[PDB]
């Protein structure tokens, strides 16, 4: 639809990704390191919406990593949260084949990357 709708969908995605990031950073746990060591596949280039395939394919492991680290203090509802992230991605990505970087990263770097991605596109749309 309008250029504004894409902008609205991106910030929706952005905020959800930031929710996960901010939740993790403020998380304080002894066995928290288990969640951070896990490697995530990264996009080689994230320039346009079509590159969101790299995020989509990594959504399920993102869910599973978050699901594994679910204590009293850390409650994010991964299944529903990712589903919310997923349906937004599909509205944006809408058969490109994801190309991945050779270097893997942690969940923090993974989140920051796609957070930067949304911000990069939004700034251009404005």
């Amino acid at each position: 639809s309008s250029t504004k709708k894409t902008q609205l969908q991106l910030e929706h995605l952005l905020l959800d990704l930031q929710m996960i990031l901010n939740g993790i950073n403020n998380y304080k746990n002894p066995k928290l390191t288990r969640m951070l060591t896990f490697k995530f596949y990264m996009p080689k280039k994230a320039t346009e919406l079509k590159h969101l395939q790299c995020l989509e394919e990594e959504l399920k492991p993102l869910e599973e990593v978050l699901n594994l680290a679910q204590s009293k203090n850390f409650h994010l509802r991964p299944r529903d949260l990712i589903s919310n992230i997923n349906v937004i991605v599909l509205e944006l990505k809408g058969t490109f084949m994801c190309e991945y970087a050779d270097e893997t990263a942690t969940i923090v770097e993974f989140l920051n990357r796609w957070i930067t991605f949304c911000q990069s596109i939004i700034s251009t749309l404005t």
């Epitope: 929706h12 929710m19 939740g23 998380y27 204590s71 850390f74 409650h75 994010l76 991964p78």
Partner: antibody
Framework: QLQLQESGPGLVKPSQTLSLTCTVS??????????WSWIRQHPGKGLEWIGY???????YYNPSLKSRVTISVDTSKNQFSLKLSSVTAADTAVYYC?????????????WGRGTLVTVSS | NFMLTQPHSVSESPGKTVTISCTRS????????VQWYQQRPGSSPTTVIY?????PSGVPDRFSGSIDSSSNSASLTISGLKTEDEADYYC?????????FGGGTKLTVLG
């Protein structure tokens, strides 16, 4: 002081869609620190969670009500609303809007005054 | 998803101590924080206990919360029962699936 106020029709006929709206005053939907929820209570029965929404727009529903509910948020007017489709006499209840922290866990504080919705034709 | 089972009613004379149990049907109850809400008739619920045993400023020290892993339950204990304590009490926890309320318990202060 942060106060929440539910707004509804009070009287709605069965099979219609119930539209509620919560208005945040003395506060705003300006941080990711909270979920914004809807809770209902059938007269003489217990409390039942309906769902809540994040200020991003992402929603989380009760599995038993997921197929009938839809929650939206309006950060500009500091309001969030609920739509409950195809209501019956079983949907007659006092509907509450409430606030709950994110991450730390689900805990509703504060609650709105609650509004009584009577479903009859 | 799970259920929280509370007794329908509990009652004791003023000054005594009463306990309201909250049993979780599925999953460990120590895995999620348990909240306790007090509701007066025709009024909105207020918090007396949040996060298992934490007590909001303004709530009397008579109110205390605990968790029993053995019986998979959560308990609200009120000492020195007062007539103001006469109300409905709801235990509440959460899951990866949804938010779960107890069936509610009517506390009666015997007059």
């Amino acid at each position: 002081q942060l106060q929440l106020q539910e707004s509804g029709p009070g009287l709605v006929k069965p099979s219609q869609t119930l539209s509620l709206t919560c208005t945040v005053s003395g506060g705003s939907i300006s941080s990711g620190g909270y979920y914004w929820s809807w809770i209902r209570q059938h007269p003489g029965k217990g409390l039942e969670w309906i769902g809540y929404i994040y200020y991003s727009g992402s929603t989380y529903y009760n599995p038993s009500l997921k197929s009938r509910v839809t929650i939206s948020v309006d950060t500009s007017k500091n309001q969030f609303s609920l739509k409950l489709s195809s209501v019956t006499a079983a949907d007659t209840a006092v509907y509450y809007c409430a606030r709950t922290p994110t991450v730390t866990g689900d805990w509703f504080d504060p609650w709105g005054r609650g509004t009584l919705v009577t479903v009859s034709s | 998803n799970f259920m929280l089972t509370q007794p329908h009613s509990v009652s004791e004379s003023p000054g005594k101590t009463v306990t309201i149990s909250c049993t979780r049907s599925s999953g460990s109850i120590a895995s999620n924080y348990v909240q306790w809400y007090q509701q007066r008739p025709g009024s909105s619920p207020t918090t007396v206990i949040y996060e298992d045993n934490q007590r909001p400023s303004g709530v009397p020290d008579r109110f205390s919360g605990s968790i029993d892993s053995s019986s998979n339950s959560a308990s609200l204990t009120i000492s020195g029962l007062k007539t103001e304590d006469e109300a409905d009490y709801y235990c509440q926890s959460y899951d990866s699936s949804n938010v779960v309320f107890g069936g509610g318990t009517k506390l009666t202060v015997l007059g």
